[PDB]
Amino acid sequence: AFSAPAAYLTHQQKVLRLYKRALRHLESWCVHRDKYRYFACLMRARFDEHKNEKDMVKATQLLRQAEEEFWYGQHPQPYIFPESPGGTSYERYECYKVPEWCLDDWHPSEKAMYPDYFAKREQWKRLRRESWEREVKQLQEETPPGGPRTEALPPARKEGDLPPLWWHIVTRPRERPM
Amino acid sequence: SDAPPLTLEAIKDRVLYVLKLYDKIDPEKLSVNSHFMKDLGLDSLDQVEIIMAMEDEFGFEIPDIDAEKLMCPQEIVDYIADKKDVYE
Amino acid sequence: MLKIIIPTTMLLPMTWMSKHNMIWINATVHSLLISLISLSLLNQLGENSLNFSLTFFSDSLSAPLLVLTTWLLPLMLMASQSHLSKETTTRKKLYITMLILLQLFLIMTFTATELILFYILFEATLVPTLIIITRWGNQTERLNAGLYFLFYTLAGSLPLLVALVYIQNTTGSLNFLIIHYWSHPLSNSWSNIFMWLACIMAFMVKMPLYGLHLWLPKAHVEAPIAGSMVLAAVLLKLGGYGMMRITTILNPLTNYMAYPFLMLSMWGMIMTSSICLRQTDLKSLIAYSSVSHMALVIVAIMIQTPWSFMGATALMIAHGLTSSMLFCLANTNYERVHSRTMILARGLQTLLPLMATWWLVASLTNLALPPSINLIGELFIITASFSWSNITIILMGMNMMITALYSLYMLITTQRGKYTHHINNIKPSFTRENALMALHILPLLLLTLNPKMILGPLY
Amino acid sequence: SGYTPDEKLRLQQLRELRRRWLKDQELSPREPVLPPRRVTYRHSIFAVTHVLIPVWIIHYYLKYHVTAKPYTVVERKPRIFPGDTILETGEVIPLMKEFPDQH
Amino acid sequence: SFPKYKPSRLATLPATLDPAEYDISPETRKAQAERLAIRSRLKREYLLQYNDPNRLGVIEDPALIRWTYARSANIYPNFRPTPKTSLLGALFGIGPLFFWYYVFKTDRDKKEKLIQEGKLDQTFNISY
Amino acid sequence: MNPFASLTLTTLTILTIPIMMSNSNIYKTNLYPNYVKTTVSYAFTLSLVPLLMFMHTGQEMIISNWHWMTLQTVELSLSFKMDYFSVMFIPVALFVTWSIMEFSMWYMHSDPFINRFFKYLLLFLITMMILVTANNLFQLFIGWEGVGIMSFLLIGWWHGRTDANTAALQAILYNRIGDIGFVLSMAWFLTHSNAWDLQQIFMLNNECPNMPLIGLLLAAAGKSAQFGLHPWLPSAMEGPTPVSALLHSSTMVVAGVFLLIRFYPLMETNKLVQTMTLCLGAITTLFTALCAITQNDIKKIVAFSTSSQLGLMMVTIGINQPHLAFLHICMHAFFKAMLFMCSGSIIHSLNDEQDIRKMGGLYKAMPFTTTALIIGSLALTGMPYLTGFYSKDLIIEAVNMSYTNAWALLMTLIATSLTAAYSTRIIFFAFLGKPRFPPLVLINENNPLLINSIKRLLIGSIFAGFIISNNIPPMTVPNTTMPLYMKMTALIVTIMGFMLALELNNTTYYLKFKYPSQTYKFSNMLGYYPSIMHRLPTYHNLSMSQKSASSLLDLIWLETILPKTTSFIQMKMSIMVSNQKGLIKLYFLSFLITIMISMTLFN
């Protein structure tokens, strides 16, 4: 989510992703902790018996039969964490998230309540206003010609600088706003 | 709900608690900044299992792209804090 | 009837002699007063009619249409106030003049006692609408839209005129009372078949009938908000009123001349409804829903039974109010976003909750939730159709389901989900918009308490 | 594997800014500045205003307006068993046919 | 060996079962790299427009405009009367009408004959 | 005068006062949920009085108070039928609603829109009362559609979640399919009986034909989620747990069975429709119990249990025992609502975790929920002398001794066994093992709201069957004499299901693992019905809606026929007429030609 993606997944990443998926589905099959521990140790032993192999061709022939075997026995109803994309509370609090800019449209009788909050908000706004003019040029000179090659962003390198394109990441609504 | 507002100290304590129950790593050697591959001599599969234990401990899942580059307890704590919006 | 006509005419000098900053206030106040005056036409008899003079008469079919026509004008003024802010005083006065002339032509058309007079005013309603569409429309398609809206209409109505004068050379009169009292059967003949087609096609094309409906989406998506309101709420019902009036001289030919249209309607209501399932424009979706409802009205009129006529009248009134409200909601989104695409502005319930409530009530009314008068008309038409043939229920039933789907679809895409992140110019709803929605929706729920007012002369 | 130094530094800067922003979301002790201006007991008032008044209105409406019209309130006829007597007339319904009783 | 998964239109092939991801060539890597490059360029453009303090309006998306235009207004100028389009139009627009006409006409003829012979039992049928 | 009618109308009327006050100052405060809860408790207490009057004598009433309109010979008026069914169902619904509102006061404490949520619950209760007390078909349709709209609004409570909106639209779709049959029945009765009033319909229909009864059966199958239209009920578990306990468990989903019960005089005169109802109920109960047997979400298990119980109710209707079906409705209300409250208590105590894989030893950790769920599971399986006994045991006996399908009877018995099996599954995987939840233990039962709300329905699910059965008049001939093995059949199959489920669940501890079989995959994916039927039809509809109706016909061929052809022909004729070089040579040659033609053609 936070990390920028690459152009492709290497062989090691694919193997590790299979290992995690297989362990999770084995846990979903083996409900009890001791049974899961036993079969997960067995799966670890099965997984690293080809850990030391050198050639790419058969190492890719493995992890293909492994995917087929996983898809045959994949527990059609695996356990999902409730906040995960398949969980029972995935986007439950999405309706309570309100953008910050809505506060700019409040009535003055509403802003009269919470004066300290809005003073701090004005401070944040002026900080953003200066930092943006710096950030545009920083990104302009830090980018290779022909455009970006990866959607990864640089940090700030000067003293009073801020990381380019920081406002909408720092001012996230919240995980549970209401 | 009635969930207590966990803090950075609680997250660090729980991460270290889970790591000290991993018998592959010596409880004397590890620290908050102790690296996984170089400081403790662990593998990539061990790192995957550590991430899974963290996920089981804290009740939420870390995506694989983010999980694959969490190589210290301190960065695990930082990731959990950023995800769960911990102030102090 | 002149107690309503003369003040409507006096609206024009009042508009033109008004101050530059007081046109909207005066127009709205006096239009509301004219609506209050026209409310007195609702006192109808179970006997013939309210025959005021030789030129004008009122019926319990004409009275609700007249009340709706007079009530729509203040709402149109309120809806037009916003997007006409940067317009010169003379052009704003011209816009209000077009609206007033349209109201005058409609008022007279509903109450005219002569078929020729009715034809003249029925065509006179075209010029203000065409000017409104092609002058104050926004996109470049408006010109083409206007052309369609014109020629389709004329292509249907030029034969009617011929038929009309022919009838007056045979019966000797085109007065509706004499025509009703001296009715004679139409024998099955080729000449009679073509007379039937000439008398029917002009009203079919303005409903619009499926297959002759291509002008309506263009005109409704290209018109300004007041034009869309008047087109969907009143101008569609002119064809229904005309067919209700003229079918008295077409029997017993209608017994078998109605088959091609009935099919075209019964299948057509399916197609248009399904079209609403895959639409990327809000106004286009609302226009196609209007086509489906008017197909049901066409079936009701062709069935020619008391329950059919009652249901058709009730459905005409209900659809007018509901479609006007839906167009106003879509326009209140458009004036903020300037796109008219459904999936651009999303999750608006979080940013505008009361407008989301208005959206819900409008969608529920379009969905025909009992005991709304929408469902009253729909159910009466469905029962009459079931008596006509028990198989019709299948198609009718299907339509019901489909309607609900697309209605809720429109409610879910725009109001629910997550808000669009980059859209940061969605301001709080103004009192004008909320009052517009309230003045649309309160009369519907009030009318459900006294449905006999909108059930027509066969109640 | 792991973070690149630039990714690490950007993450620390972003998280410091985010922690500051989250800390700025707290309210001061006086923050909700509320402007004041005006112009068995609870169960008793609840029973008076939510039960007694509606039942009075409904009983009046039923007793003096609804029943003023025929067939508005139609009652199921009470059941009559042998040996009963009628208030209106006063006759006694005869008993049954003394069926042979055993077990 | 295990029983094979057979993909369909409404149940597509898993990415982990694609042989195309196991046939890696330098040209494939270059294609992936340039796809990521164009995605990164579009993301940078959007994020520059999105984080700008000065901007106070909906960001215009050319892709969305192209989608709506292609779905609505680009249809007819690219229409060509072909045997396939002619046949499909005739079927889908004419066949249902005559099918329903036949069904309803047969039903009403049956009902009318029953009424004329008097054997229909329309007792209590007062409202129509 | 005769306080029966005044009391019956007052209950429904005072149910509406908080809706009027929803715009007052109480709605903006935090006392509104308690206001609504107190109003519902008062309404329950008031409605207890006409039930006592009916129990003493048998009081029955029709109240046609407001005349709505008159279409010639058809008079539509606001009429209420205060019969046995109404005066028995209203107290039960009010009792369950009071318990659910007290539970929601604790469950939804951190929800910002709790006032709106309470208001929504009261609106559903009002619509359901309108449905239950209606005397004509139009008022019944009003309640029918009101409960559906409230279900749509409460399923999609969290409107930022895509799945909730999808589930709400799914419920609307299936209930619209049922609405087709409802409208069919209304049209038939208006055309043939000249009435929507129930009395005239009963008078004029001594041998009811197939069409209106088939329409009624379609509506009942739609609203009670029978096998053809079943998946929306399990999909409706997207809503908050109180919504699942109130609407989609015990009160709203029994509306189709209620509709079939209301029209039972016409149903007993038709044998084909009775057989159709029997087969539909049997297949529904079997299929839903089979699906429930392998589920891992606890709310899904309870929802499939509700669906199977509804199928059993329809089986009871099919064998011409409507009063037994009403009794089962009343008992199921109690114990199913309490089961859902216990499940919601567990879910809240485990940090909104719903999977039974992640709940272990709760028998000792939270004892009150354990006892309540144990008593509810015993009541659901028809333990003798409990609330479910007095309905389920009689239903099983009646199906055993009746002239009916052998297949339907076998399916009913197998479904009873499967009911015992999934009750065993819930208990075994939620209470008996070692803990399998995250280390931070936040388990807490000590809230008086939760305890009292659960305890009232506990007392109900223990004693209500005995009280109600002994206090109602006999409405059917009893099955006094029976073979001994036939009398014990329900108990025998329940014990066999218990034993087999326990034996199969005890093997999950063995250190062996194997891949699943085809039957397990069929049971886990709900017979693959949601997959195919939610992917093949919808796609083929939507695709057509774009390819043929919109593009081919509307945008191309209808455009080609009338306007484009006219434009093309007129433009070609204009080019033909106006393209003249301006040479008098050709003009005067043409003049000569026309002069000759006029000379030699028109004379």
Ligand SMILES: CCCCCCCCCCCCCCCCCC(=O)OC[C@H](COP(=O)([O-])OCC(O)COP(=O)([O-])OC[C@@H](COC(=O)CCCCCCCCCCCCCCCCC)OC(=O)CCCCCCCCCCCCCCCCC)OC(=O)CCCCCCCCCCCCCCCCC
């Ligand atoms: C008349 C004399 C009366 C006395 C009768 C005899 C008394 C009783 C004798 C017992 C007889 C059998 C009872 C045991 C039930 C089976 C248990 C079992 O072994 O399951 C494990 C075993 C494999 O499971 P697994 O892969 O290891 O699961 C992985 C873990 O265990 C995952 O585990 P988990 O933790 O996730 O969940 C465990 C769950 C998961 O287990 C499952 O997968 C569920 C599947 C098994 C239960 C299904 C039983 C319902 C049968 C209804 C069938 C209706 C017709 C449908 C037709 C289908 C047509 C395609 O299992 C359970 O919860 C317990 C299962 C049920 C036990 C409690 C009730 C059983 C007694 C009720 C039935 C008989 C008494 C009725 C009383 C009335 C008196 C007659 O399941 C099977 O192999 C199925 C066995 C029987 C299925 C027959 C259907 C095959 C159809 C193939 C096609 C044939 C040709 C058709 C051509 C058609 C052309 C049009």
Ligand SMILES: CCCCCCCCCCCCCCCCC[C@@H](O)O[C@H](CO[C@H](O)CCCCCCCCCCCCCCC)COP(=O)(O)OCC[N+](C)(C)C
């Ligand atoms: C395009 C989008 C839709 C627009 C609206 C469409 C609605 C208009 C449809 C016109 C209605 C039908 C017109 C005539 C119906 C009369 C019945 C007759 O046609 O059927 C048979 C007639 O047989 C044949 O039809 C003879 C005519 C055949 C030639 C007509 C052309 C057929 C298709 C043309 C369709 C073109 C429509 C569009 C024009 C641009 C009956 O046999 P018969 O008993 O002997 O005649 C009875 C009539 N009598 C008593 C006067 C003698």
Ligand SMILES: CCCCCCCC/C=C\CCCCCCCC(=O)O[C@H](COC(=O)CCCCCCC/C=C/CCCCCCCC)COP(=O)(O)OCCN
């Ligand atoms: C949206 C576009 C729709 C276009 C209009 C479609 C309707 C066309 C209706 C026919 C047009 C002419 C109507 C005639 C006016 C009625 C007068 C009448 O009925 O008198 C008849 C005359 O009837 C006719 O002459 C009609 C002949 C038709 C000539 C014009 C052809 C127009 C096109 C015909 C086919 C299309 C009609 C349906 C189109 C469907 C929609 C596209 C009797 O004449 P007599 O000789 O005095 O009496 C006989 C005893 N001696």
Ligand SMILES: *OP(=O)(O)OCC(C)(C)[C@@H](O)C(=O)NCCC(=O)NCCSC(=O)CCCCCCCCCCC
């Ligand atoms: O040091 P790390 O970076 O952690 O590297 C780890 C490792 C060296 C093992 C790996 O990344 C790697 O690079 N290996 C090189 C060769 C290689 O891995 N070849 C492929 C081996 S495939 C395999 O491990 C067999 C899979 C068997 C398990 C099948 C899963 C089926 C489960 C079914 C559902 C329960």
